[PDB]
């Protein structure tokens, strides 16, 4: 709980509204936020109801120049951005600057796949939803509302998980070597009465 320049949030298993509210409060506090893996955000309510909610959202359009009408964004990252910006005073310079401090992406791009990704417990579905309750996935609602990049993200995420697993195995082996040398070192038992 210390002020970092950039917080990378792995949005897997989170709730859209709860994560948006927490992020919107951090941006007004003046913190750069990168919400990666937005195709895994969870929304309460069963999938058919959520798709009806979204398909009702498409209905809002101008009767003159739908080019000026409401802009319906189908990407899961843009869905999260719409949720976040609705919780911000974006009509003012403060809120407009706050939006510039948020980077919502699909998947985990290489500039952010090699950085620690914290999670928000106040938005996690496992901790915040009663078991036995129906929910949906934004990355699934997006595919059946118009989003057309689901397959590429899934493929590029399988590659990323494979590479990350290889990296962790190498780091775990090095950590095992360091861990083995730990008790071999003597001061770790000689004067460890301080609790370390």
């Amino acid at each position: 709980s210390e002020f970092q320049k950039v917080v990378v949030i792995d949005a897997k298993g989170h709730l859209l509204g709860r994560l948006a509210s927490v992020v919107a409060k951090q941006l007004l506090g003046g913190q750069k936020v990168v919400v990666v893996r937005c195709e895994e955000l969870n929304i309460s309510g069963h999938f058919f109801r959520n798709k009806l909610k979204y398909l009702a959202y498409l209905r809002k359009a101008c009767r003159y120049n739908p080019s000026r009408g409401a802009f319906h964004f189908r990407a899961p990252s843009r869905i999260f951005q719409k949720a976040v910006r609705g919780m911000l005073p974006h009509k003012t310079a403060r809120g407009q600057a706050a939006l510039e401090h948020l980077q919502a992406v699909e998947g985990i791009p290489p500039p952010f796949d090699k950085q620690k990704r914290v999670v928000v417990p106040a938005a996690l579905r496992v901790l915040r939803l009663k078991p036995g309750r129906k929910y949906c996935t934004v990355g699934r609602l997006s595919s059946e509302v118009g989003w057309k990049y689901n397959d590429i993200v899934a493929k590029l995420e399988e590659r990323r998980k494979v590479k990350s697993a290889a990296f962790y195995q190498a780091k775990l082996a090095k950590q095992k070597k360091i861990a083995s040398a730990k008790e071999a070192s003597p001061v770790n038992q000689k004067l460890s009465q301080f609790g370390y």
Partner: peptide
């Protein structure tokens, strides 16, 4: 999204008219 056909929010004449005519209903049943 509202996801409704009829808005759940009410106009000020409409909300005021309830207390106008709900009281009269109690007057009538009295």
């Amino acid at each position: 999204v509202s996801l409704k056909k009829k808005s759940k929010r009410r106009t000020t004449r409409l909300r005021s008219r309830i207390e106008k005519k709900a009281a009269e209903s109690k007057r009538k049943q009295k």
